[PDB]
Amino acid sequence: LTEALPKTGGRNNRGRITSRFIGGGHKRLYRIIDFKRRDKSGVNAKVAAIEYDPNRSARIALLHYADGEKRYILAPEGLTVGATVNAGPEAEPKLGNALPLRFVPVGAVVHALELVPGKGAQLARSAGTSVQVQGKESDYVIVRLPSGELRRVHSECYATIGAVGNAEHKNIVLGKAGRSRWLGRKPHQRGSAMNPVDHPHGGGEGRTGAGRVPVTPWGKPTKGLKTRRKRKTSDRFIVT
Amino acid sequence: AKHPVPKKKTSKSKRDMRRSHHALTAPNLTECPQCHGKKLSHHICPNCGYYDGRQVLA
RNA sequence: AACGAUAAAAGAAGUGAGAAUCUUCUUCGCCGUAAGGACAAGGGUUCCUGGGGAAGGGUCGUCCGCCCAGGGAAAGUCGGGACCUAAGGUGAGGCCGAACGGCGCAGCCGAUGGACAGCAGGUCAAGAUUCCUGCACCGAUCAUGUGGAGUGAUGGAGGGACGCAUUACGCUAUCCAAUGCCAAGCUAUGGCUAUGCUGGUUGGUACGCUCAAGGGCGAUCGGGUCAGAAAAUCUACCGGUCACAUGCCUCAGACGUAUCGGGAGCUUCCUCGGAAGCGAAGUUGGAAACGCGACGGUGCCAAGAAAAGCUUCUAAACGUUGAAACAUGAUUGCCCGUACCGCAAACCGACACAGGUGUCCGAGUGUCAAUGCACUAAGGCGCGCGAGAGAACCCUCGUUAAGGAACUUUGCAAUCUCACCCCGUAACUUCGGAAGAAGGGGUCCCCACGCUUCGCGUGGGGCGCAGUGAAUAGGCCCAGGCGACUGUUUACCAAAAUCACAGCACUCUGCCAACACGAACAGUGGACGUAUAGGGUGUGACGCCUGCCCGGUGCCGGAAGGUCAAGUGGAGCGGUGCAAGCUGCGAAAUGAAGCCCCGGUGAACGGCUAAGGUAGCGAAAUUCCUUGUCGGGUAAGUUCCGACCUGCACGAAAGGCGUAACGAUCUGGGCGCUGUCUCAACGAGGGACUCGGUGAAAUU
RNA sequence: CCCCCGUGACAGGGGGCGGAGGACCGAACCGGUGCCUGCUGAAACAGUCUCGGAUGAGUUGUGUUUAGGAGUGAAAAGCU
RNA sequence: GAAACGAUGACUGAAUCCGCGCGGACCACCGCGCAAGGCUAAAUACUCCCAGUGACCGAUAGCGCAUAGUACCGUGAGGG
RNA sequence: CGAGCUGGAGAUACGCUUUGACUCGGGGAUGUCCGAAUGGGGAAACCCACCUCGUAAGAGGUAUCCGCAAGGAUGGGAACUCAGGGAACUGAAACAUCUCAGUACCUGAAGGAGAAGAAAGAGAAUUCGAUUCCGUUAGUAGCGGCGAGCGAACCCGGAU
Numbered sequence A: 001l002t003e004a005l006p007k008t009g010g011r012n013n014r015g016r017i018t019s020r021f022i023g024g025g026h027k028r029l030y031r032i033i034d035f036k037r038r039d040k041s042g043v044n045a046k047v048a049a050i051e052y053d054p055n056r057s058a059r060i061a062l063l064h065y066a067d068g069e070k071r072y073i074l075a076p077e078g079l080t081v082g083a084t085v086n087a088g089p090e091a092e093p094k095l096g097n098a099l100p101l102r103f104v105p106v107g108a109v110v111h112a113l114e115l116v117p118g119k120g121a122q123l124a125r126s127a128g129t130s131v132q133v134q135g136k137e138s139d140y141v142i143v144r145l146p147s148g149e150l151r152r153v154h155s156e157c158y159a160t161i162g163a164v165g166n167a168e169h170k171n172i173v174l175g176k177a178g179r180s181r182w183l184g185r186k187p188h189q190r191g192s193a194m195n196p197v198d199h200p201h202g203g204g205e206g207r208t209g210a211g212r213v214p215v216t217p218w219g220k221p222t223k224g225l226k227t228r229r230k231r232k233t234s235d236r237f238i239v240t
Numbered sequence B: 001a002k003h004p005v006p007k008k009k010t011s012k013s014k015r016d017m018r019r020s021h022h023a024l025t026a027p028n029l030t031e032c033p034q035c036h037g038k039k040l041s042h043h044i045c046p047n048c049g050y051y052d053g054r055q056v057l058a
Numbered sequence C: 001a002a003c004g005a006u007a008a009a010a011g012a013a014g015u016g017a018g019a020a021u022c023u024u025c026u027u028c029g030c031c032g033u034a035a036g037g038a039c040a041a042g043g044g045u046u047c048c049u050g051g052g053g054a055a056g057g058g059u060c061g062u063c064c065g066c067c068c069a070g071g072g073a074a075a076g077u078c079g080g081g082a083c084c085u086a087a088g089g090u091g092a093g094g095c096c097g098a099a100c101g102g103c104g105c106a107g108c109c110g111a112u113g114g115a116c117a118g119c120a121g122g123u124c125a126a127g128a129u130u131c132c133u134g135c136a137c138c139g140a141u142c143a144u145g146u147g148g149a150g151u152g153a154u155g156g157a158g159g160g161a162c163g164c165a166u167u168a169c170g171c172u173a174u175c176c177a178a179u180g181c182c183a184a185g186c187u188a189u190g191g192c193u194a195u196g197c198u199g200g201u202u203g204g205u206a207c208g209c210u211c212a213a214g215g216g217c218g219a220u221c222g223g224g225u226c227a228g229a230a231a232a233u234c235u236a237c238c239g240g241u242c243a244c245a246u247g248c249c250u251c252a253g254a255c256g257u258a259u260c261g262g263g264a265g266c267u268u269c270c271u272c273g274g275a276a277g278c279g280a281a282g283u284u285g286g287a288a289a290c291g292c293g294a295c296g297g298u299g300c301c302a303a304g305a306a307a308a309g310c311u312u313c314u315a316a317a318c319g320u321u322g323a324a325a326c327a328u329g330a331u332u333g334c335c336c337g338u339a340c341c342g343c344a345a346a347c348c349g350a351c352a353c354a355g356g357u358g359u360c361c362g363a364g365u366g367u368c369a370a371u372g373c374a375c376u377a378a379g380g381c382g383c384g385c386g387a388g389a390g391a392a393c394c395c396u397c398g399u400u401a402a403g404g405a406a407c408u409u410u411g412c413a414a415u416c417u418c419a420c421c422c423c424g425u426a427a428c429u430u431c432g433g434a435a436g437a438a439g440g441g442g443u444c445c446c447c448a449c450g451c452u453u454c455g456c457g458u459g460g461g462g463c464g465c466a467g468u469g470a471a472u473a474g475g476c477c478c479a480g481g482c483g484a485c486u487g488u489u490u491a492c493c494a495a496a497a498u499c500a501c502a503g504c505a506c507u508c509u510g511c512c513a514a515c516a517c518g519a520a521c522a523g524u525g526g527a528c529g530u531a532u533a534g535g536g537u538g539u540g541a542c543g544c545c546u547g548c549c550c551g552g553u554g555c556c557g558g559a560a561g562g563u564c565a566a567g568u569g570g571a572g573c574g575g576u577g578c579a580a581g582c583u584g585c586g587a588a589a590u591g592a593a594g595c596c597c598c599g600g601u602g603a604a605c606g607g608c609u610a611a612g613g614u615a616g617c618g619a620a621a622u623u624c625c626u627u628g629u630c631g632g633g634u635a636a637g638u639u640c641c642g643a644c645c646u647g648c649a650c651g652a653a654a655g656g657c658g659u660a661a662c663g664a665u666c667u668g669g670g671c672g673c674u675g676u677c678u679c680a681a682c683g684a685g686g687g688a689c690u691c692g693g694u695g696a697a698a699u700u
Numbered sequence D: 001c002c003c004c005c006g007u008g009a010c011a012g013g014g015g016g017c018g019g020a021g022g023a024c025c026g027a028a029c030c031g032g033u034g035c036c037u038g039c040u041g042a043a044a045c046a047g048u049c050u051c052g053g054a055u056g057a058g059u060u061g062u063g064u065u066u067a068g069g070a071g072u073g074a075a076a077a078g079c080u
Numbered sequence E: 001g002a003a004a005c006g007a008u009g010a011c012u013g014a015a016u017c018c019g020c021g022c023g024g025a026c027c028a029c030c031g032c033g034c035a036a037g038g039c040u041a042a043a044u045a046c047u048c049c050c051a052g053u054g055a056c057c058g059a060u061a062g063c064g065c066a067u068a069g070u071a072c073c074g075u076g077a078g079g080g
Numbered sequence F: 001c002g003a004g005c006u007g008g009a010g011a012u013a014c015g016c017u018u019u020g021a022c023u024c025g026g027g028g029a030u031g032u033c034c035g036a037a038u039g040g041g042g043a044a045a046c047c048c049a050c051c052u053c054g055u056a057a058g059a060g061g062u063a064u065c066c067g068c069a070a071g072g073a074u075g076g077g078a079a080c081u082c083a084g085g086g087a088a089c090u091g092a093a094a095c096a097u098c099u100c101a102g103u104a105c106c107u108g109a110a111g112g113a114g115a116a117g118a119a120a121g122a123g124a125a126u127u128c129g130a131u132u133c134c135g136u137u138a139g140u141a142g143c144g145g146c147g148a149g150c151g152a153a154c155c156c157g158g159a160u
């Protein structure tokens, strides 16, 4: 609703359908969100209003800084219009404050967590997601991620106080095909409804199934798709 | 295809025999009692336009 | 055989070697939300004139969209360009790649979008918002005066700038009425004598103490640098002062005066028919847009392009002695498009083809409404063979005694029903529905009385067989299977019980995500998303639910050990030379993921040896035997419903059972009606037959 | 949203008023259900009649993108 | 293959003339030769074009063409 | 060259030519716009510019890659040449190593030719004396699911 960009639809890369499905949609505009917040250290901002944001799930908050620079931030669960928000290491454990993990107390619930100092927020961004802090190790802090995974994130990285907005994606029951169309194209086309050519679940005489695999080769219910990577050392306890 | 079709070419003989009735019968031409050009029985003489008196122009 | 829609055609006059077919006149009939009119695309001279008459034209041509020659097309303002950007394309530098090449920031290209100055008329044989007449507007260079000092970027900001539904007030285009006005005459068949009949009844511009709904708006001073790269007098933010109504600003449109125009028709000339000259009236009442006022109001979630033009700021620069802005004169006005066809005989369809083709306008009367239906304006057309006949048969129709489904695979087909108003309406239910359930009544004309109209209600009266009097115009019900539902599909034999679906589950994925495209340590999709997210796979609304088996296979997990590759390691055996040396093969032990081995795992592949079916269903879209058996309905029931269980060979997310509503779905029954039938008849039109014209085919 | 009536464990029920919907009927438009016709066609897939959708998962113009073991596919081995 | 020799993608890596490479694993002897820099005419090949000739053709032959890559077909490549 | 010419053109009109037309042989001079295409754009043959000289007409320039600069490169060639990349049908009476074949095709670079070339060689006479080509050795030697089948070189003769 205030100084945004044009998000143009596209589901194919260099030419080909690369992410299966994906189509319809109500033609949305892009709102730039301050995911990092570092440069606004020390400066206080007023919550002008909580706006609607397609592209997200998390409600959007319009910040009116004292220096008159306007920015958008993911609205946390609780933040009301006419409240103050401050960025920088100097920050209270109050809603919407941006403060690095070292200054963040243990047992605290956070969202919009970084991964590398800078870049911007990368974890717990969608509505109702929380990061439970477990307690410091060195430069690194052990954190509980929305999945249940415990990661070693260095205290040098920012976070925002509280859980994400838009309360609950529950009473949202879609309703009918076509509600799903206001967003993404004729969903999941069963490979069992396909032909031998098209997919491995193709063919046979009637309704069936025989070895359980995806579109291309592989296998689908249980198969560690994660690789033998370096980011593994900075990670302790995964599953559930 | 084109369902009933001829089985063999009809010979020059057979084709011609069928045409033994195709000959036109010459009109029975009468001579006009006036203008003296020939005419058709029960019709106005073409030439004078007569049929006892003169009916049609010329 | 056919001559390309069953929208007709008739006569007269003309022309000509020649006339059903060409011209002209008077009729007739067909379209009229089109079969009229205006673009766009596309075609290319098809346009107009004068000629022609081989071939093309399903016949014939004297004619033509054909053939020949000549002509016709006019823009500062309309489209496009010299302006802007979207998807996309390209792209110095740059990132990748046997080559050829692939990517890619800015930038540039790119309308289907933004931006931007002109209207009313006239008329060539053929152009017109282009020419011409009238009176406007836009920008540029200069001149003369006003004016007296800034002007303000390649960068800042504002602004351009955007949805869907619904809706209040005002108006216009436009349309109706009349004993309003103006103009022309005449009518007679019985009447009217005009209060009858026909026709016309205001477009642009300028000004106006005239009316006017609606619509748009804050103005200023100051503070903080931490914001717009910097600067800013511009913008944002915070604070202070006047921010009710109002108050300013804007007039859609109306009215009036003027003026240019047009206007029914009249007037003369007439070389077969056009040119020229003249010109009346301009009322009142009603309706009324998808247009205008306008960026209005409200509601809603799926949250509704960019960039330039523009408006406001300073930077640098020139200048403050000739600034910007205004006003009036002159000058200036580039390139491409413009004919014609354009729902079609000029485009795509091999043809002058019953198809297909994006946008706009699209009058009247009647009918709740309407772009529906009938008729009809304006306009366009009778579909490029014709004429007889009145057989069989075939096509498209009308009626039909008595019967009424007996037809048949099957009421397939074809009737019945049919609009609006009033009464009335079931089981069953997800309480919305089912419902237009079912059923019944009304409907026209005149008069009088009442009111809320365009019209309606009550009373009485009239006419016909009949009053949605013609056209448009649901047959309904009971029970079942399947699928919840709207939707999607096999262009061209399958529309469905297929696929999809909202919902549910398993599962993977921690972000340079999994996964995907790719020559690639490129790049991109996933995603400018981040586990309330994304990939995959299955089931398929909702309700109650989803059991037993982990032996085999797969997946996740452990590791006491066995098995295992290159390599490290070289014990030994062997060649040759006189000899050091040079050389050929080579064990043990060590050496990874894997596999054997152990545990787990079913909304994993599966099963009913690892176990032998929990509910629920069952002769079923599943049952062989089979027309199972008993009951229902029928005069009679291989199908159908219901029970029963002996399930050849049901069964729980390859979901099990049930479920209101939905269905051009499939099965069985009933009412209604009927030419489906007993059993066919009569009648109509179009072929078939006959003549004149033109004249194919497969086959042999 | 505004007036009204209800309290046994209940829920709402009524009046106004609003104007929702992969709601209904129906043109245009998209479509192709059943019959006949056509079957050397008017037509290399059509016609009359009947029928489905008709504010949506809608229809349509331009402009542009993806193709050959490749594309696309509300999935027929369909379309290219 | 007993597979020498050339060649090189990955890893390594020497000698310098009592020196190096070769001689079909490999050794010794005998013998042939100097890599890790570059150029180099002629003999060879082909025929768009030009001339000459022919137990080559003479209009369905011969070039696709007595001339046309035209007419015609196709969106195009192409075909003709 | 020495009288005709005015293209095919079967065609009339106007003319030209012994002060040597016409034609032929050899040079020049003009050569619109497109095309490597090259100022910028572009849907080839069209739009739109700027800079220098100039009285307007009009003339010249404005692409990237090499190098100081002179000067060179882009693009086109029927087949032939070398290079990078490289099929399958087919044979094997099936097929998989093998064959077809390093053929066809694509791509690069170039010329009238190219390629190759001046022995760390051939090779067994202590012969030879750069390369290419032709005959020959020779279907020998050999390779080979030792199958289908594939197939050298030295000597010698010869072109140069």
Ligand SMILES: CC[C@H]1OC(=O)[C@H](C)[C@@H](OC(=O)N2CCC[C@@H]2c2cccnc2)[C@H](C)[C@@H](O[C@@H]2O[C@H](C)C[C@H](N(C)C)[C@H]2O)[C@](C)(OC)C[C@@H](C)C(=O)[C@H](C)[C@H]2NC(=O)O[C@@]21C
Pocket: B001, D039
């Ligand atoms: C409608 C016209 C259309 O014909 C049909 O479609 C009918 C219906 C079809 O019938 C059919 O295909 N069928 C399928 C079965 C029912 C129907 C049929 C069969 C026989 C007679 N009548 C009808 C044929 C009779 C059939 O022949 C039949 O083929 C059978 C394979 C064998 C028969 N033999 C035994 C005599 C033969 O007649 C064929 C294969 O066609 C499609 C014939 C071939 C020659 C063909 O392609 C024609 C050019 C064909 N295509 C076209 O455009 O026009 C045609 C003539």
Ligand SMILES: [Mg+2]
Pocket: none
């Ligand atoms: Mg780009």
Ligand SMILES: [Mg+2]
Pocket: none
């Ligand atoms: Mg007739």
Ligand SMILES: [Mg+2]
Pocket: none
């Ligand atoms: Mg008779």
Ligand SMILES: [Mg+2]
Pocket: C480
């Ligand atoms: Mg049942």
Ligand SMILES: [Mg+2]
Pocket: C483
């Ligand atoms: Mg269904």
Ligand SMILES: [Mg+2]
Pocket: none
């Ligand atoms: Mg449906």
Ligand SMILES: [Mg+2]
Pocket: none
């Ligand atoms: Mg005849």
Ligand SMILES: [Mg+2]
Pocket: none
């Ligand atoms: Mg209907």
Ligand SMILES: [Mg+2]
Pocket: none
């Ligand atoms: Mg219906």
Ligand SMILES: [Mg+2]
Pocket: E059
């Ligand atoms: Mg001859």
Ligand SMILES: [Mg+2]
Pocket: E065
């Ligand atoms: Mg030729």
